A paper describes a structure:
Similar cytoplasmic localization of Imp9 was reported in the Human Protein Atlas. To understand how Imp9 recognizes histones for nuclear import, we solved the crystal structure of human Imp9 bound to full-length X. laevis H2A-H2B (dissociation constant, KD = 30 nM) by single wavelength anomalous dispersion to 2.7 Å resolution. Imp9 is made up of twenty tandem HEAT repeats, each containing two antiparallel helices A and B that line the convex and concave surfaces of superhelical-shaped protein, respectively. The concave surface of Imp9 is mostly acidic, with a few small basic patches. This charged concave surface of Imp9 wraps around H2A-H2B, burying 1352 Å2 (26% of the H2A-H2B surface) at three distinct interfaces 1–3. The N- and C-terminal HEAT repeats of Imp9 (Interfaces 1 and 3) clamp the histone-fold domain while the inner surface of central HEAT repeats 7–8 (Interface 2) interacts with a five-residue segment of the H2B N-terminal tail. Interface 1 on the histones involves α2-L2-α3 of H2A and α1-L1-α2 of H2B, which constitute a significant portion of the basic DNA-binding surface found in nucleosomes. A basic patch formed by the Imp9 H18-19loop and nearby helices complement an acidic surface on the histones formed by residues from H2A helices α2 and αC, and the C-terminal half of H2B that comprises α2-α3-αC. Removal of the H18-19loop reduced the affinity 15-fold (KD = 450 nM). The way the Imp9 solenoid wraps around H2A-H2B leaves the predicted N-terminal Ran-binding site of Imp9 accessible and ready to bind RanGTP.
Eukaryotic chromatin is organized into nucleosomes, which are structural and functional units that are composed of 147 base pairs of DNA wrapped around two H3-H4 dimers and two H2A-H2B dimers. Despite their small sizes, histones do not diffuse into the nucleus but are transported by nuclear import receptors of the Karyopherin-β family termed importins. Imp9, the human homolog of Kap114, was previously shown to bind and import H2A-H2B. Here, we solved the crystal structure of Imp9 bound to the full-length H2A-H2B dimer to understand how histones are recognized for nuclear import.
Residue numbers in the entry:
A (entry chain A): 15 to 904, 908 to 934, 997 to 1040
B (entry chain B): 17 to 102
C (entry chain C): 26 to 28, 31 to 82, 85 to 121
The structure:
Amino acid sequence: GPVAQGLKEALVDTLTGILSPVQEVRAAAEEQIKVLEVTEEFGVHLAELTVDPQGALAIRQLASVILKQYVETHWCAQSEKFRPPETTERAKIVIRELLPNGLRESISKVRSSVAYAVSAIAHWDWPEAWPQLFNLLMEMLVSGDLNAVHGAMRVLTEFTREVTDTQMPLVAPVILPEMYKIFTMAEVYGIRTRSRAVEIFTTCAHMICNMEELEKGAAKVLIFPVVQQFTEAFVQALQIPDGPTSDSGFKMEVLKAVTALVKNFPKHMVSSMQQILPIVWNTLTESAAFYVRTEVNYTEEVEDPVDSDGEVLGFENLVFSIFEFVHALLENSKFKSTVKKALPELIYYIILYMQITEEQIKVWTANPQQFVEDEDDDTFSYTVRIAAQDLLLAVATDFQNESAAALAAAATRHLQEAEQTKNSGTEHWWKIHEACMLALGSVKAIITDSVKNGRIHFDMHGFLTNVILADLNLSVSPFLLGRALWAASRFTVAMSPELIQQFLQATVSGLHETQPPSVRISAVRAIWGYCDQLKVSESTHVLQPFLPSILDGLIHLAAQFSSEVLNLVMETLCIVCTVDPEFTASMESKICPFTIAIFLKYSNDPVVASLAQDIFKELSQIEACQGPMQMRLIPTLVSIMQAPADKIPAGLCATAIDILTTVVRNTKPPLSQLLICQAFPAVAQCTLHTDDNATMQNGGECLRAYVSVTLEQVAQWHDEQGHNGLWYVMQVVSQLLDPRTSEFTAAFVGRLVSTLISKAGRELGENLDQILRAILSKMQQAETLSVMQSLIMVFAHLVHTQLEPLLEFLCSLPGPTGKPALEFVMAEWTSRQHLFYGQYEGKVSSVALCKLLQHGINADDKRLQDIRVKGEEIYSMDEGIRTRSKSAKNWTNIPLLVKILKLIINELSNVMEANAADPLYQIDLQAYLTDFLCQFAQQPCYIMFSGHLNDNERRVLQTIG
Amino acid sequence: TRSSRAGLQFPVGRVHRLLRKGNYAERVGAGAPVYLAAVLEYLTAEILELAGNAARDNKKTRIIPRHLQLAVRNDEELNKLLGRVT
Amino acid sequence: KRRRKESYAIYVYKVLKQVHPDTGISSKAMSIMNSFVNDVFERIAGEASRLAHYNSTITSREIQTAVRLLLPGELAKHAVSEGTKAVTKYTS
């Protein structure tokens, strides 16, 4: 039409205006196209401008760039980054009829954009709206125009990832044969194009795998005969040295395809493994030599005497795929034997891959925090070195004894070769020592166990002395010295007394500031290992004389580093505190002020606060520390609790309360006036004035600790108004059970109430009822299990102490119901009993239900009998997964005592399965429940109780009688 | 057969080894992988149901990443679940 | 990018053919499902792990608990319904 032809001339004018130096024409052309974008045929005109081969390249390039972005944003209304208007059916038909011919374009940048746009469309339109796309692309492959195959192959990479099981029977038989032609015709098609052919093979194979392992008969008919031809072609191509027909990225794709077939069609490739393994092995060893020359020991500053046209891209990613291939063999029951047989040679080459690179040396020296992060056992970093180490850990976990013997032989060889290299004047000989020490330390448990039992030939004492110790006194690289301190600490169990003395001395020297950061960090890790291992072995005596210098070394290091180094020093400082309590107490005068200063300085960091808290906990558990540390720590905690909430960092106050709770829990009564007259009021006041749920909960647990440890002093304390301690506890219990606040304020109030009743209760006895009424009112608001369990556990505890008054009390009010409150407690309790968590909370609730059942029967307490509750949901066994939607398109009501009998049978089931894998604490729940049920089954009432039990419950009862 | 006598498509056996192979606990009952496997299987059935529903609502026959995205966000509980797990 | 460790694709595919037998799933969608399943596993394996100290022995009780700490509302109820049905038939 005439308006479309004029709207297209407008587009051309705007495109030429976007390509102008005068900013005025570009700023106007910018506002113009903001309107053309909403035209119906905007994309149609862009498609025409891009595809037609005679236009100006500057226009075609631009139309294609905007065409891609238009299709990405306008083609589907349900798209995420959708921008209206949606391309109309009229426009889509035209654009779909238009773009395919643009895949034959001579210019690459235009052909690629046309291909990207075609893939965007297929994502939304195939197969419903563009049924002919596949047959259309296949034509382009076999046309003979090498620009058609480049464009069609660039689309087929994405298209085949859009094909599902429904359409794969029609795509796989057709496309795979053509991918084989393209893949094997190395003299016609380029590397990248043949690589895309492997991608399409691997994509089809993954989909065929899903179909085959659901319904057998899909892989015989679609790919199995061509797997033979492809695998043969893949192994031929893996032997091609880098050149005009192969490069690393291409070799990687082949290897990933082979690996995919090994994981998905193992039974079908047993016939080819004899050919593959030697070839991948050649790839593994050659790549090791190339990696070491071009990454490990490569100095950028060295100028080549002879230039080459060199591009070695993505070589690191090839290496990764080699490890992945080995992992695949390891994860197959039949193929893993070939790795087991190759462990001595495999682990030899793994160690080559584990060597520290020059780039790694550059980074770690410049950022000690990266060193801590990269060399942590739980690091998220992924490097050739870490991947290699992971492959070692795998084979060592699968073939413990064979890996120990293989690693011993590998290290012995490496060390022999390293002595020669060192004597040749090669600077980087030490990297073999560093990698060997890393390897042996990574799997230290299997080396020491095999050496102790004489299963392997390995000079342990020579290794510790002539490698580890010797390298500690060498000055070749801080990363060698540091690795040695670490390695020694791993082999603590195999060391002579003469050695452990020298290594501990060397570790303390590793901490001093004259050492480079990586060494000091390594020494900290080493000290952690010594403390941890010598405690388990009950051999901490050898460590005692070094504690003074260790402590000073750690504190001094913390003053110079923050972030992850500090966290490492704080973790190690903490474990040091657990070696010799006598020592920790004598050094309280510096440990505690240091930790407080850290605690406050990094108050904005919860990780440090928790580490400070761990140290405070270890000091609080040492009697000789409590006095001195409390005069120190309590004023600081009190300062935190009185500070304004909006002015201190989040969580600091809640952590301060938890630290206080730990002090109270560990101090034998009576408590200092510092704890009673300063701390207790501050925490009570802090809990009553806070709006933070975490503070409130911790505050209540703190007052619970006071009440539990020294009830007398809480009672005898008063403020100026006469209010005593139990008054403040009551006010807090009131605020936590307040139905007007959050549900979570009561997440732990149940423990406070139960402890208060257990200790006082009688004292201010009218309050008990008022608390229970508050609990009930709070259960009505509460929906979460944890909260409900905390509340319901209050009544569960009262079943053991005041059974009859409880039933009397609960029948004496309606609660938040139109029924007796006893109906409300038992309705909420019985419907949640199966979810309660806690070994202690489980016993209290379990036997409480037994006693409720025992009382309702021996007596004729009809307050219990006459109650009805939910029982079970009746589900079919011949129906699939019952989703929420299946639940709205469709529960028994039974006597309370029957439901209770079932819950008891369930508690027996869960306690049996857990074993087969108040002072009630000591009762064997399994024995008690077993005892209760056997006696219960013989009472005359059981006759009609049994009829109510389902199959699973009856099974549990036959297991017992 | 282990998954078959649990009425599950998902692999009880592999889930068991993933638990043991991890530094989670040093003892695991035979009933843990069964329960966990049924949960994993129940969640994928809930997501696939709603994501396939959305694909059917656009007269499409293939689930694509956007359909999973719609299923999750347009369902309060699945949306709530994926924020805490990511 | 160490070793998204597990491949549940074949099992996601089976479950797909029960809820929607005539609907397929693309490679990227399947990969997302596999990542999702792997994440939910590692989270249930983190909660059920840290909880074994509050009660170190994981069973149908401690993953059922971690399942309710993590799943909200009906997802949590139906999950426990499908979970307990599995263990029941598994021990029958």
